[PDB]
Design an enzyme around this catalytic site. Structure first.
Site, PDB file in Angstrom:
ATOM      1  N   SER A  37      19.986 -45.082   0.473  1.00 47.41           N
ATOM      2  CA  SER A  37      20.123 -46.300  -0.003  1.00 47.41           C
ATOM      3  C   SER A  37      18.521 -46.828  -0.238  1.00 47.41           C
ATOM      4  O   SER A  37      18.009 -47.076   0.638  1.00 47.41           O
ATOM      5  CB  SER A  37      20.746 -47.346   0.996  1.00 47.41           C
ATOM      6  OG  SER A  37      20.665 -48.625   0.307  1.00 47.41           O
ATOM      7  N   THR A  62      20.592 -47.368  -5.914  1.00 48.07           N
ATOM      8  CA  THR A  62      19.408 -48.055  -6.250  1.00 48.07           C
ATOM      9  C   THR A  62      19.953 -49.493  -6.515  1.00 48.07           C
ATOM     10  O   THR A  62      21.073 -49.550  -6.947  1.00 48.07           O
ATOM     11  CB  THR A  62      18.774 -47.530  -7.573  1.00 48.07           C
ATOM     12  OG1 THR A  62      19.284 -47.995  -8.741  1.00 48.07           O
ATOM     13  CG2 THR A  62      18.895 -45.935  -7.679  1.00 48.07           C
ATOM     14  N   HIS A  63      19.014 -50.319  -6.384  1.00 52.09           N
ATOM     15  CA  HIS A  63      18.876 -51.861  -6.899  1.00 52.09           C
ATOM     16  C   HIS A  63      17.932 -51.711  -7.927  1.00 52.09           C
ATOM     17  O   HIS A  63      16.768 -51.873  -7.450  1.00 52.09           O
ATOM     18  CB  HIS A  63      18.733 -52.632  -5.401  1.00 52.09           C
ATOM     19  CG  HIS A  63      19.830 -52.931  -4.634  1.00 52.09           C
ATOM     20  ND1 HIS A  63      21.108 -53.214  -4.808  1.00 52.09           N
ATOM     21  CD2 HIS A  63      19.694 -52.709  -3.197  1.00 52.09           C
ATOM     22  CE1 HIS A  63      21.813 -53.537  -3.525  1.00 52.09           C
ATOM     23  NE2 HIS A  63      21.096 -52.932  -2.843  1.00 52.09           N
ATOM     24  N   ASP A  92      23.670 -49.880  -7.591  1.00 51.42           N
ATOM     25  CA  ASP A  92      24.273 -50.737  -6.463  1.00 51.42           C
ATOM     26  C   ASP A  92      24.455 -52.314  -6.937  1.00 51.42           C
ATOM     27  O   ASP A  92      23.708 -53.068  -6.330  1.00 51.42           O
ATOM     28  CB  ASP A  92      23.743 -50.815  -5.076  1.00 51.42           C
ATOM     29  CG  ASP A  92      24.791 -51.666  -3.978  1.00 51.42           C
ATOM     30  OD1 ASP A  92      25.863 -52.250  -4.446  1.00 51.42           O
ATOM     31  OD2 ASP A  92      24.340 -51.726  -2.635  1.00 51.42           O
ATOM     32  N   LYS A  94      26.996 -54.391  -8.161  1.00 41.25           N
ATOM     33  CA  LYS A  94      28.027 -55.272  -7.498  1.00 41.25           C
ATOM     34  C   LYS A  94      28.465 -55.997  -8.648  1.00 41.25           C
ATOM     35  O   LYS A  94      28.580 -57.300  -8.497  1.00 41.25           O
ATOM     36  CB  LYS A  94      27.607 -56.112  -6.353  1.00 41.25           C
ATOM     37  CG  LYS A  94      26.824 -55.146  -5.310  1.00 41.25           C
ATOM     38  CD  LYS A  94      27.399 -55.711  -4.016  1.00 41.25           C
ATOM     39  CE  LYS A  94      26.555 -55.406  -2.695  1.00 41.25           C
ATOM     40  NZ  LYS A  94      26.691 -54.116  -2.352  1.00 41.25           N
ATOM     41  N   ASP A  97      31.721 -60.621 -12.289  1.00 40.69           N
ATOM     42  CA  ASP A  97      32.089 -61.708 -13.178  1.00 40.69           C
ATOM     43  C   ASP A  97      33.355 -61.324 -13.966  1.00 40.69           C
ATOM     44  O   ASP A  97      34.003 -60.422 -13.422  1.00 40.69           O
ATOM     45  CB  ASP A  97      30.756 -61.970 -14.388  1.00 40.69           C
ATOM     46  CG  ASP A  97      30.737 -63.296 -14.382  1.00 40.69           C
ATOM     47  OD1 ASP A  97      31.495 -64.080 -14.941  1.00 40.69           O
ATOM     48  OD2 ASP A  97      29.470 -63.909 -14.430  1.00 40.69           O
ATOM     49  N   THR A 101      31.799 -60.540 -19.749  1.00 37.70           N
ATOM     50  CA  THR A 101      30.425 -60.544 -19.321  1.00 37.70           C
ATOM     51  C   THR A 101      30.103 -59.267 -18.505  1.00 37.70           C
ATOM     52  O   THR A 101      28.912 -58.695 -19.064  1.00 37.70           O
ATOM     53  CB  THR A 101      30.272 -61.873 -18.416  1.00 37.70           C
ATOM     54  OG1 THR A 101      30.582 -63.026 -19.074  1.00 37.70           O
ATOM     55  CG2 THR A 101      28.825 -61.850 -17.613  1.00 37.70           C
ATOM     56  N   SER A 152      30.074 -54.980   5.341  1.00 33.19           N
ATOM     57  CA  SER A 152      29.591 -54.647   6.756  1.00 33.19           C
ATOM     58  C   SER A 152      28.893 -56.199   7.322  1.00 33.19           C
ATOM     59  O   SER A 152      28.471 -56.068   8.349  1.00 33.19           O
ATOM     60  CB  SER A 152      28.233 -53.780   6.603  1.00 33.19           C
ATOM     61  OG  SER A 152      27.601 -53.997   5.735  1.00 33.19           O
ATOM     62  N   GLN A 210      23.310 -58.571   8.535  1.00 34.41           N
ATOM     63  CA  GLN A 210      23.691 -57.139   8.449  1.00 34.41           C
ATOM     64  C   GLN A 210      24.061 -56.466   9.928  1.00 34.41           C
ATOM     65  O   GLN A 210      23.592 -56.764  10.922  1.00 34.41           O
ATOM     66  CB  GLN A 210      22.539 -56.163   8.040  1.00 34.41           C
ATOM     67  CG  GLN A 210      22.796 -54.870   7.865  1.00 34.41           C
ATOM     68  CD  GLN A 210      23.901 -54.147   7.229  1.00 34.41           C
ATOM     69  OE1 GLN A 210      25.091 -54.612   7.319  1.00 34.41           O
ATOM     70  NE2 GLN A 210      23.581 -53.169   6.171  1.00 34.41           N
ATOM     71  N   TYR A 212      25.231 -52.964  12.222  1.00 29.08           N
ATOM     72  CA  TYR A 212      25.188 -51.539  11.989  1.00 29.08           C
ATOM     73  C   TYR A 212      26.177 -50.966  13.028  1.00 29.08           C
ATOM     74  O   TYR A 212      26.118 -51.231  14.202  1.00 29.08           O
ATOM     75  CB  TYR A 212      23.578 -51.196  12.602  1.00 29.08           C
ATOM     76  CG  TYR A 212      22.667 -51.277  11.391  1.00 29.08           C
ATOM     77  CD1 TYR A 212      21.583 -52.383  11.754  1.00 29.08           C
ATOM     78  CD2 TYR A 212      22.738 -50.802  10.022  1.00 29.08           C
ATOM     79  CE1 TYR A 212      20.804 -52.746  10.663  1.00 29.08           C
ATOM     80  CE2 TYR A 212      21.808 -51.280   9.161  1.00 29.08           C
ATOM     81  CZ  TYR A 212      20.943 -52.137   9.359  1.00 29.08           C
ATOM     82  OH  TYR A 212      20.012 -52.265   8.396  1.00 29.08           O
TER      83      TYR A 212
HETATM   84  O1  LIG Z   1      28.625 -54.036   2.266  1.00 25.71           O
HETATM   85  C1  LIG Z   1      27.550 -53.556   1.944  1.00 25.71           C
HETATM   86  N1  LIG Z   1      26.371 -53.580   2.888  1.00 25.71           N
HETATM   87  C2  LIG Z   1      25.309 -53.300   2.400  1.00 25.71           C
HETATM   88  O2  LIG Z   1      24.343 -53.225   2.937  1.00 25.71           O
HETATM   89  N2  LIG Z   1      25.173 -52.595   1.082  1.00 25.71           N
HETATM   90  C3  LIG Z   1      23.857 -52.301   0.623  1.00 25.71           C
HETATM   91  O3  LIG Z   1      23.489 -50.966   1.380  1.00 25.71           O
HETATM   92  C4  LIG Z   1      22.113 -50.901   1.831  1.00 25.71           C
HETATM   93  C5  LIG Z   1      22.110 -50.890   3.190  1.00 25.71           C
HETATM   94  O4  LIG Z   1      20.837 -51.027   3.859  1.00 25.71           O
HETATM   95  P1  LIG Z   1      20.389 -50.629   5.029  1.00 25.71           P
HETATM   96  O5  LIG Z   1      18.736 -50.952   5.157  1.00 25.71           O
HETATM   97  O6  LIG Z   1      20.786 -49.412   5.719  1.00 25.71           O
HETATM   98  O7  LIG Z   1      21.081 -51.855   6.013  1.00 25.71           O
HETATM   99  C6  LIG Z   1      21.496 -52.149   1.158  1.00 25.71           C
HETATM  100  O8  LIG Z   1      20.683 -51.894   0.024  1.00 25.71           O
HETATM  101  C7  LIG Z   1      22.597 -53.051   0.962  1.00 25.71           C
HETATM  102  O9  LIG Z   1      22.290 -53.887  -0.357  1.00 25.71           O
HETATM  103  C8  LIG Z   1      25.932 -52.720   0.129  1.00 25.71           C
HETATM  104  C9  LIG Z   1      27.410 -53.215   0.562  1.00 25.71           C
HETATM  105  F1  LIG Z   1      28.172 -53.335  -0.228  1.00 25.71           F
HETATM  106  O1  LIG Z   2      34.650 -67.955 -12.770  1.00 26.35           O
HETATM  107  C1  LIG Z   2      33.885 -67.863 -13.645  1.00 26.35           C
HETATM  108  N1  LIG Z   2      34.285 -68.126 -14.919  1.00 26.35           N
HETATM  109  C2  LIG Z   2      33.617 -67.575 -15.866  1.00 26.35           C
HETATM  110  O2  LIG Z   2      33.888 -67.463 -17.016  1.00 26.35           O
HETATM  111  N2  LIG Z   2      32.125 -67.649 -15.837  1.00 26.35           N
HETATM  112  C3  LIG Z   2      31.187 -67.471 -16.872  1.00 26.35           C
HETATM  113  O3  LIG Z   2      31.064 -68.678 -17.377  1.00 26.35           O
HETATM  114  C4  LIG Z   2      30.820 -68.409 -18.935  1.00 26.35           C
HETATM  115  C5  LIG Z   2      31.835 -68.937 -19.802  1.00 26.35           C
HETATM  116  O4  LIG Z   2      32.027 -68.204 -20.778  1.00 26.35           O
HETATM  117  P1  LIG Z   2      32.979 -68.386 -22.113  1.00 26.35           P
HETATM  118  O5  LIG Z   2      32.405 -67.703 -23.497  1.00 26.35           O
HETATM  119  O6  LIG Z   2      33.161 -69.986 -22.249  1.00 26.35           O
HETATM  120  O7  LIG Z   2      34.307 -67.763 -21.424  1.00 26.35           O
HETATM  121  C6  LIG Z   2      30.573 -66.808 -18.914  1.00 26.35           C
HETATM  122  O8  LIG Z   2      29.247 -66.413 -19.107  1.00 26.35           O
HETATM  123  C7  LIG Z   2      31.214 -66.227 -17.597  1.00 26.35           C
HETATM  124  O9  LIG Z   2      30.374 -65.060 -17.202  1.00 26.35           O
HETATM  125  C8  LIG Z   2      31.766 -67.654 -14.463  1.00 26.35           C
HETATM  126  C9  LIG Z   2      32.479 -67.748 -13.487  1.00 26.35           C
HETATM  127  F1  LIG Z   2      31.875 -68.016 -12.174  1.00 26.35           F
END
Ligand SMILES: O=c1[nH]c(=O)n([C@@H]2O[C@H](COP(=O)(O)O)[C@@H](O)[C@H]2O)cc1F
Ligand SMILES: O=c1[nH]c(=O)n([C@@H]2O[C@H](COP(=O)(O)O)[C@@H](O)[C@H]2O)cc1F
Lengths: 259, 256
Positions: A37, A62-63, A92, A94, A97, A101, A152, A210, A212
């Site tokens: 990570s 990566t983020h 990563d 996640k 929506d 989108t 986690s 977090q 561990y």
């Molecule tokens: O449940 C989660 N826990 C996480 O920590 N992560 C990512 O893993 C990475 C763990 O980082 P750590 O420094 O080992 O805690 C961190 O980048 C989080 O965004 C993703 C998840 F989905």
């Molecule tokens: O529950 C949700 N529904 C959504 O539709 N949206 C967003 O609102 C916006 C509504 O888009 P629409 O074109 O009116 O469907 C769109 O950018 C979605 O990502 C967000 C949410 F959190």
């Protein structure tokens, strides 16, 4: 559980996904079930760790939206190292929506994720529409998704019927979904990959929730395939030696589960 | 039911929510515009032309092919000029330590321009804690996503309750919710609702629409988020006013 297959055997399963199969073969080829990570804010430093930790890893996570100096050529240099040290790239992001989108966030914008990331993850709270919208972009490009079945962090709501639902959504999208982010084995089909974050050698946490657990616990007792480790390595004075310790601890924990 | 001007003066209101509730009353608008466009130039041209009709511009900064921080400066200028808040629909959804960095740093620097951002409760309250560390310093607010507009959504029952409890307990940073309905009794909290169209429909990818009358009038929501209903029109302003009046009158009729 049923009888545990090895990663090599798993990579050859009829219902296996191409991405997972590529991953699994390298997990057995390099004896690494460690995902780095790579939590860093400079492009340069992400490339330096990839180049040096690469031989120790089955994946790089990566983020990309933490990078201050992101350009697509930094992802072109990162594919090179991935092609050469042999690991998958896992962004990563996640997704979380609606289908319409998530579809554009995956293909487009400045990051163009679906053009360099073998793997992404999605949360399942929006319903299967998130996965459906992702598969329209990722299939044409030969990519997979991971579905966050548990988390986690403290107070996390991915538990119970939530988890059962991620698992269902995954079975019904096997052509794109290659496994899970979770804390334990959540699926019984061995074509699905389990990757576990919240991993450190020593017991603990951070100040923002977090939690561990250790490689042995996560891979041995709980059923995970792979461990995602961030600061446990990145913080270390000797990041290579750190990566190696986590490699060996996770690898052996898997060998021991196998027989 | 209080009005929007009265809620702006509630003891436990947040400065952002307060600024928001005022201009809504000053402008007679509870239309938030979901500006899902790839070209920055169209983004600004909509913001400029539709500014007076809206109270909030909701963005997906990550969908913009030509994102620069200057696009955001130009956008802030129009938000100050026409009086709407900027909502980055980012949906932070990782752990405390990561979201803080995603919120503050990287290319997007969301905290330098967004009055408001949103976050999923799924990880637990760490998500909010991470955000509030960057956010509070800068006079920012968060909306929690408590329900969702899409088919098979898991934001139901105990899930929705947990978002509410989590907002309750972080009311110094959380100024309300994304939901289909009223989910809180506390009038300090803003309720903003996506999946809003005049005609009954959906899209081919999970989205379900209800109408401004239904959403503001029957379900008790405050604000409507509308993307395709307006952006797809030949004439976006005409469509915007259509949604404004629909929503604005649906609110007055709830007041008595
Ligand atoms: O449940 C989660 N826990 C996480 O920590 N992560 C990512 O893993 C990475 C763990 O980082 P750590 O420094 O080992 O805690 C961190 O980048 C989080 O965004 C993703 C998840 F989905
Ligand atoms: O529950 C949700 N529904 C959504 O539709 N949206 C967003 O609102 C916006 C509504 O888009 P629409 O074109 O009116 O469907 C769109 O950018 C979605 O990502 C967000 C949410 F959190």
């Amino acid at each position: 559980a049923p009888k545990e297959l090895s990663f090599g055997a798993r990579a050859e399963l009829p219902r296996i996904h191409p991405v997972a199969s590529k991953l699994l073969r390298l997990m057995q080829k390099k004896e690494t079930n460690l995902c780095l990570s790579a939590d860093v804010s400079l492009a340069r430093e992400l490339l330096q760790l990839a180049d040096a930790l690469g031989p120790s890893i089955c994946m790089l996570k990566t983020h990309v939206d933490i990078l201050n100096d992101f350009t697509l050529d930094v992802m072109k240099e990162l594919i090179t190292l991935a092609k050469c040290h042999e690991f998958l790239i896992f962004e990563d992001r996640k997704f979380a929506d609606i289908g319409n989108t998530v579809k554009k966030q995956y293909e487009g914008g400045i990051f163009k994720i679906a053009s360099w990331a073998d793997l992404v993850n999605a949360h399942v709270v929006p319903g299967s529409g998130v996965v459906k919208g992702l598969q329209e972009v990722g299939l044409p490009l030969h990519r997979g998704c991971l579905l966050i079945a548990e988390m986690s962090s403290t107070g996390s709501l991915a538990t119970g019927d939530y988890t059962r639902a991620a698992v269902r959504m995954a079975e019904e999208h096997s052509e794109f979904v290659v496994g899970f982010i979770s804390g334990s084995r959540v699926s019984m089909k061995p074509e699905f990959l389990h990757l576990t974050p919240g991993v450190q050698l020593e017991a603990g946490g951070d100040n923002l929730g977090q939690q561990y657990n250790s490689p042995q616990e996560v891979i041995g007792k709980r059923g995970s395939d792979i461990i995602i480790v961030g600061r446990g390595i990145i913080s270390a004075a000797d990041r290579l030696e750190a990566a190696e310790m986590y490699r060996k601890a996770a690898w052996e924990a898997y060998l021991s589960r196998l027989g």
